[PDB]
Amino acid sequence: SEYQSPGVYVEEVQSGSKSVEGVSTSTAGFLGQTERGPVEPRLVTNYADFERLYGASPKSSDLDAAVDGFFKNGGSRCFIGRVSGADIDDVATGILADDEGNEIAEVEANGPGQWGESVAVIVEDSQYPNQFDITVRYWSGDLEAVSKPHGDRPDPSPDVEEVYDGLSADPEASNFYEKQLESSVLVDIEYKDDGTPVDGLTWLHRDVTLKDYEGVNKPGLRTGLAGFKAIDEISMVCAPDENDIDGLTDSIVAHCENMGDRFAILQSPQNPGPVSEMETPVDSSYAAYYYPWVNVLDPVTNREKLVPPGGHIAGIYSRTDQEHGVHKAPANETLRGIVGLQHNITKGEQDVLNPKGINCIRSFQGRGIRVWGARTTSSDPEWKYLNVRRLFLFIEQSIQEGTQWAVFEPNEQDTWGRIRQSVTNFLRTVWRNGGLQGQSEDDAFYVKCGEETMSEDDIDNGRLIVEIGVAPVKPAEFVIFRISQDT
Amino acid sequence: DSSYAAYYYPWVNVLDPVTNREKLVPPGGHIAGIYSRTDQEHGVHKAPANETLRGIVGLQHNITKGEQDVLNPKGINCIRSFQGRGIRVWGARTTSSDPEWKYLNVRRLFLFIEQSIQEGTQWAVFEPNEQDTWGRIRQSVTNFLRTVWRNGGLQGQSEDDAFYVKCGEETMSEDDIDNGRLIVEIGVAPVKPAEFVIFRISQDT
Amino acid sequence: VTLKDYEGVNKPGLRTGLAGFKAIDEISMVCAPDENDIDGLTDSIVAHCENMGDRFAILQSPQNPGPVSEMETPVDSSYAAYYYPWVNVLDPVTNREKLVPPGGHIAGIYSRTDQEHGVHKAPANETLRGIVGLQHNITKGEQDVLNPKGINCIRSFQGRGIRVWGARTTSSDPEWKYL
Amino acid sequence: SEYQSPGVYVEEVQSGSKSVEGVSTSTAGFLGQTERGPVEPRLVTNYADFER
Amino acid sequence: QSEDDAFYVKCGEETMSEDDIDNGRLIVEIGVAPVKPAEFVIFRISQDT
Amino acid sequence: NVRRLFLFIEQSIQEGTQWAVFEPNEQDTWGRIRQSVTNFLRTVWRNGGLQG
């Protein structure tokens, strides 16, 4: 500071260490087809939210089953992205009119597709002066059989119902209908002119490939994977129908490798061929591969049905992360929400599959159905185990996001000590929770920043270099007992 | 291509107090205010970057990380907007091509030091050119530079690493004394900013 | 009214708006209930509090802030706090419910906590008096996304009532994370 | 790596040793005539599999 | 648990030099340790001992 | 058994060292390779396969 006139001065100084906070690690992302809903990614925390916002899947998709398996196994949060074969602007619309026939508002469905042709909007008048009520109804089945869509009890009870009571036409009020109808899973309203609508009912009229899974990337609209790559909470991605669309596995693995902060879960085909000839599709350290398919009860036929196991496995990942940590291998855990498997694998066949990076789901007598295998598809010996990759992702993202205060700071010993202290505190916390291995701190990790890592050419060019060394913990895959008679 | 100038980009948006609408203006005065604030709360040796802009609504364009890799090595300073952090100045270089005056705070520190020395030494003109005056001048300049060092402006774990001052028979010869010249030599080591923060992480030990 | 009326007059013998407030040394927190109807007022309030250096700013979200996965705080100051959502009250001219921002109730909670506990006590896990209900009910899954972003929530627990659940600032500096 | 714009960089380094794993050593191959079956080689882990 | 853990105050010849005295500066250095809230209350329960 | 042991060792080495192709030909790679092969052979020695 500068002191030019007499007085009292109070100044604040920076302290000797700054805390780092860990990031989320149990959020998932799903892609696939639905019947209703928007095409921008939305967060879901429960299965009833999913049924309310999106509905069911068509016969060519198995998204509903995968989300159900995710939440039955202890998952916490999903990001849903809806993929649609229709143009984004193929949306049903409508108009509201005033006393003498002026269009005052414009109603639009909340997503593209033919479903918007089955939405009815009903306007009625309220008992209080200058107020009216609005109702929105949606039927999932045939419209030809709906007898009284306007009455208090239609012939088939509607699938979705929404009512808004205290509405007004004053734009500066808090009960203006544009502000109240904004939280609605069915429609959108836009204001045009001054007036209040007349009573009655009205319907909305005039309504996949690899490039749809890739998504749209425009200045104000993102779908598909382009929409996911602008969300920083997702830590694992899955596409249940990845084997019906050629060229999607590589796109998913490339997305995860280019972001550098997420993991890919892959499932085998329904018919992968002979056992002696199976291989993994990719050779990435950012993916894992599971086998075989599973059996579930179908809620529209009440019969068994064969589905891929991806969502159940993502739910197992989330559960293990919540109750043990990211350093725990998500294997030797039970699958909930299924009836049986496609095949039963023996111990002789897994001796051929396990050294190849293929993870198996097996069933033991007296113990149930469990995941038996925790490897990645990688050939590098340094990234053979899955929990090591997940721990490194967690650590690296925490460091990246929690150190932006240090840019443009003086390149001298105070900043060096501060940075060293922060990183040491974070790594000691990780060590205390069982993630690092060693009976002392010197065995588990080290951090270096000073004149041993930086030279003078570095200081003259603006570079601050920190070197960190760590020792992760690995699972026990073979438990061996050697018993003898001696001593 | 001067060492006495800095160059900022792009324009900003403000509310106009006669129309109550947005309006696009150059960012010069906001940046000068940031300079003044940083000088008041940190010192002249602190780079006036990674600081927030107050009093605006938005920018003209949003610059990405790929475009700044082309602009930054050219001496052009950018104003960017980060999600979760706001609008900030990201760059602290001069328009100069000389490698000795690449950073802005070094030039500002030298301006400060040189003007202080120029204005606070006029008592020494026409004084006797002998050892007493030499010791007096040396002592004064050493006190000033040690004060600058203690406040974080100079770099080194000891005084010998940060600066030196010389005045005597090693700087002056006899032809100098006969012609009325008193020569003082000063050497200094300024501190520079941390522009790239690098973390190299491995699995060994 | 405009932004220049909220800024106030600054003449030798007349001060209104914020120019009038900056000559009073008792004020310790400032709030403007209608800050979302006048564009450019949030920044002016945060700048006033940062330039005086002795007061704190309380901010409320809009009535329609968008999807949950896209919310952010308006500023990145250590001199401000951000609360969400709106509340319901009885209107004394119609005797009906009405939706209002929660700023004044929260300032009253600040004052109460300061009187009965001290300035070192976090003004959270405290009850809101004088309301009827909230705008939305926030779950535990949605606050896991909002809390690490500096957004403070007002929630309702069964058996315990309506309470403020969160005590952070809008700041990104790790040294000024808590209020 | 190359550093052209200011920010934070995180980089991974290769470690000082890489593990080697032993290969299988107790699998056999048989050739001869049968009454049924395919003519591509198939893996068998039990005699009932062979008869089937 | 003690005063040395909570704060310190310094003013003397460790904070001021002679160039400071000659220019009219009096420097006081204060260090403090504030208390922070309990946001996560965690109970780890086991069967051992 | 000598022939069978050599078959085992040579195939393990062949299949578990493909990361080293096109790497820099300098002291770091040398130390890394030496360390890996020494660990494998010490494991073989501890199980009674080598003599000394």
Numbering used by the authors:
A (entry chain G): 2 to 208, 292 to 571
B (entry chain A): 367 to 571
C (entry chain M): 292 to 470
D (entry chain B): 2 to 53
E (entry chain M): 523 to 571
F (entry chain B): 471 to 522
Question: What does the paper behind this entry write?
Answer:
Here, we report on the structure and function of haloarchaeal contractile injection systems (CISs). CISs have adapted to a range of functions, but their conserved core is composed of a sheath-tube module (also called a contractile tail), which assembles onto a baseplate. To facilitate toxin secretion, the baseplate triggers contraction of a dynamic outer sheath forcing a rigid inner tube, tipped with a spike protein, to be driven through membranes. Our first major insight was that the CIS gene cluster in Hb has a T6SS mode of action, i.e., it functions while bound to the cytoplasmic membrane.
Next, we tested for the expression of cis genes by performing crude purifications of CISs from Hb cultures. Mass spectrometry analysis of these preparations detected the presence of Hb protein Cis2 (Hbor_38820), but no other CIS gene cluster components were identified. Using single-particle cryo-EM and helical reconstruction, we obtained a 2.9-Å resolution structure and confirmed that the sheath is composed of Cis2. Except for the flexible region between domains 2 and 3 (residues 209 to 291), all residues could be built into the final atomic model. Within the sheath monomer, three domains are observable, with only a section between domains 2 and 3 being unresolved due to flexibility (residues 209 to 291). In contrast, domains 1 and 2, which face the inside of the assembled sheath and facilitate the contractile mechanism, show a low root mean square deviation (RMSD) of around 1.0 to 1.7 Å. The Cis2 homolog from S. coelicolor showed the highest structural similarity for both the entire structure (4.1-Å RMSD) and only domains 1 and 2 (0.8 Å-RMSD). Contracted sheaths were observed as either free-floating or perpendicular to the cytoplasmic membrane. Our second major finding was that Hb disrupts proliferation and induces cell lysis of Hv in a contact-dependent and T6SS-dependent manner.
